[PDB]
Amino acid sequence: HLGKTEVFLNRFALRPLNPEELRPWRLEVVLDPPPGREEVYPLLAQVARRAGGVTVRMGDGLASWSPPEVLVLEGTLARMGQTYAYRLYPKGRRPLDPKDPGERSVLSALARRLLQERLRRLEGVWVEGLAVYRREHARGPGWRVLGGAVLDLWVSDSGAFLLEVDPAYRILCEMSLEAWLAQGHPLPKRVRNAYDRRTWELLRLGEEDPKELSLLDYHASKGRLQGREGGRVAWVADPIPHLTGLLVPVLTLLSLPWEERRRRTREIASWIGRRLGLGTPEAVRAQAYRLSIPKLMGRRAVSKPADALRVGFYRAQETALALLRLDGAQGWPEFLRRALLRAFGASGASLRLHTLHAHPSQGLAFREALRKAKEEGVQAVLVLTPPMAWEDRNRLKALLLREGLPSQILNVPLREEERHRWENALLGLLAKAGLQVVALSGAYPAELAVGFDAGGRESFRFGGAACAVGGDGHLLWTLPEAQAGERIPQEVVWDLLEETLWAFRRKAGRLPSRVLLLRDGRVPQDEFALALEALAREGIAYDLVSVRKSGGGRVYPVQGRLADGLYVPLEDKTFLLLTVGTPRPLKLVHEAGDTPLEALAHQIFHLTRLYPASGFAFPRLPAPLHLADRLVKEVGRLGIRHLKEVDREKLFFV
DNA sequence: TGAGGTAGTAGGTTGT
RNA sequence: AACCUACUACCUC
Ligand SMILES: [Mg+2]
Ligand SMILES: [Mg+2]
Known part of the structure; x- marks a missing residue:
């Protein structure tokens, strides 16, 4: 195709x-x-x-x-x-050999060091290891910004150096945290130090003198206050006091137009090839196959999900929606009401708008209002409220969840003419109701595609999964599991996988014949071991794909405009996916399974259009993975405990 | 919290 | 080293 x-x-x-x-x-x-x-x-x-x-x-x-x-x-x-x-x-x-893969590998780690430690001793240059900064883009009063590119070196398998170049910017201060803070700049972002490599956050400066272990008396007695003396007190986390004498601060704050990006890539390439005695850059050309436009379907064919609001949903159902207004007023804003009714007019079945006449300030009493609403058929609630605060925003989202009521927030100063914004909140709302907004009119190799991501939190993370019950289908999620780090426990993968398998059984009356397994990022060795033995035993076939947001590198046209949904295969088992400043393609790796790459490239990209709550844009990665990223984030963000009574056909986290 | 994204600054998990 | 995140800022519909 x-x-x-x-x-x-x-x-x-x-x-x-x-x-x-x-x-x-x-x-x-x-x-x-x-x-x-x-x-x-x-x-x-x-x-x-x-x-x-x-x-x-x-x-x-x-x-x-x-x-x-x-x-x-x-x-x-x-x-x-x-x-x-x-x-x-x-x-x-x-001796070592290129044709042989085992030697090509160590030579690269030499070639990296060659690059790295042949870059240290160059001239008009600033080197941060693999990163080289070659020019001045801006010099400020103690605010320098050097800007070259990041590099890498390796070997070709015919015994020839390769050089990846990609244009970067660096920012470096010249002054102390006082020799600078007394020149205009407000309170710091992070107080980085030269006494160590260690740093800290930035609360608010202490009003009193550190003269009263010992706060100030230890510095000028540790031989730490010789060369530059402390000025005023400091206050941050891991309250703690620090003498702000010596600290070459770390500071944060333009993105280059795509054309100049390739220009500088080629230029910097030459430079490094000639100065390092490595020859003439002959830019590596790969061929790249244009992928086929997917046909996303509401009630009828449509180009962006938000067009389902005017055309009709792919599978609607008898539904009811509540409204919480936390600002002043009372009504469903007509246009939102008129907007909904017309999307259900377009679709088959009936709608009911309710109105929560309760405020959370009522305390426990406010839950009763929720108890009543859900009872009287309410499925999800749209909340109109002035920009909330994270801490409040979470406490409320989770309250409603604890009653099995997904919430969509719409920020309050809203005008009709604010059209895309409320249009997405509506899709968001319906997604949260249970609605199958859009789906895929297509012939695919995997009837089920699951996403795995991990973790939303601090010390521990959540491993979770999300489904698409495929060749359009239902999107649904699964209760996550608390875990130590990023690696999802071998058995937990399989357990989650099975629950997703069984979902398909309930909607098709048949187990799948082929599943698509998508991980966020690299798959830790053997974390899909079980599931894959498990699948193979149940005689259900599969493919596993590492899906990397970072690391895709850059892709440039030879001439013309690189077009949306392009697929470039690279090495065996690995390919890029430019879904169109300068774009960044997905790096994807086929880790396991016997499906031809083009075919996976196909689903993946097609699976890209499925995500119900984007409306106008399309997320860079496939609907399952995105969902997995979103679910897992949200659980970590506000706890697993609220999910018990939440129907998992309702995507509460979008 | 409308949503998508790239670009700087951090840090951390995997895993050598 | 290979990948996730978190902030910031800017763009787009
Ligand atoms: Mg949302
Ligand atoms: Mg992740």
Whole structure:
């Protein structure tokens, strides 16, 4: 179903590696005394750096392209606790191969260090590792903004360097937190320090003198207040006092037009190829297949979900809606009422607008009003209220949920002419009611696509999932599960997966024959182990896809305009998805399953249009994943405890 | 809290 | 190192 273009992405192919580069030098170290059970990630990776040149680790040890006699062999360094002192013994040199994948990998980590530690010693340059800043874009009175690009280096599998370039900006202050704060700037965003690498937030400055452990008496007695003296008190978190004498502050606040972005990518590329003796940049061109427009369906074919409000829903049902007005007045604003009635006029079944005549200030009594409403058929409520505060906003959302009443907030100074804004709140509201706004008129390989994301919170996270009961279907979610970190427990994945499988059984009378499994970001090794054995055993087929928002790189046209819904395959098992300042395609990886890439690229992009509450825009990632991101965020944000009596056909979190 | 997004500054989980 | 987030600001319908 595709028509080819040819784009080239922001990579460049530079000179092939030469003999000496195809056979690095190995060296064994001395740990005196030996490290610890975790103290090897900065302590093996602090000696591989202390050596100099292009020294970069080789698993349990180090490697170089530099002769070991120009290595610094005998030195002394430490992480806090054990003060080590390294010494380097050799092991000779052994060849490596590009065609072979196993060697191509270590060479890159050398090539990265080559890049990195050949960038340190350049001239009119500012280097933050892989990042290079080449020009001045703005110089302010103690407010410098250097701006070049971020880089990377690796090998091609034919033995030739590759160089990814992408234009960045950096911001660096010159003054103290007083030599600057007494020049105009208000209270700081974050007080970064030079005494350590440590920082803190910024509350409000203490009115009193730190002269009364000891607040001020310890500084000028710790030899910490010599070179620059403390000025006034500081107040932040992990109340605590700090003498604001020495602290090269970290400051926060234009985005470059797409054309200039490619121009600078190519220019900076040349520069780094020629200055670093790596040759002429021959920008890598990949071919990119144009993907087929999906046919999203309300009552009838429509281009953006918000058109369902004028045309009719894909599956409506006998429904009722409540209204909470927290501002002054009382009425459903006619146009919102007229707006709804016409969308249900367009659709098949009937509507009822109710009105909550209760304020939460009534306390417990206000719940009674809710008890009555739900009872009398109310499904979700639209709330009109002046911009609320996060803490109040959450307490209320969760109150209604505790009565099984999803809430859509519309911020109050509203005018008819404010049209898109209220139009989205309405879709949001119906999504929260249970309505199947739009769906996909299509022939797809996976009849069910589930999204997995994780975590909304602090110390612990929630692993959760959302469904689309596919080839248009119902969107529904599942009760999440509290977990330690980002990795969703192996059994929890399967448990969630099954609950999503069973959902399909209830709507189709049949288990699926193919499911689509989508993770947010990288899949931790083996976190889909179970589900996949589990599926295979039940003889239901599948594909697993890592879906990365970051890392897609850039994609540029050779000439013309890159068009919406473009698909570029890269390496085996991996492809980009430009769904159109400068766009950022999704990096996607087929981790498991036997479906051809184009076909997945197809669903994914098509699954993109499904999301019911975007109205006019389309989210960058597939409706299940987005839902998963949204659900999981919201649960973490206001607790799992409120969800019990909330029907999971109702997307309360949009 | 209308929603989508890119661009700076942070940090953290995975996992070497 | 590869990916998530959180703030900020700006754009778009
Ligand atoms: Mg919403
Ligand atoms: Mg995530």
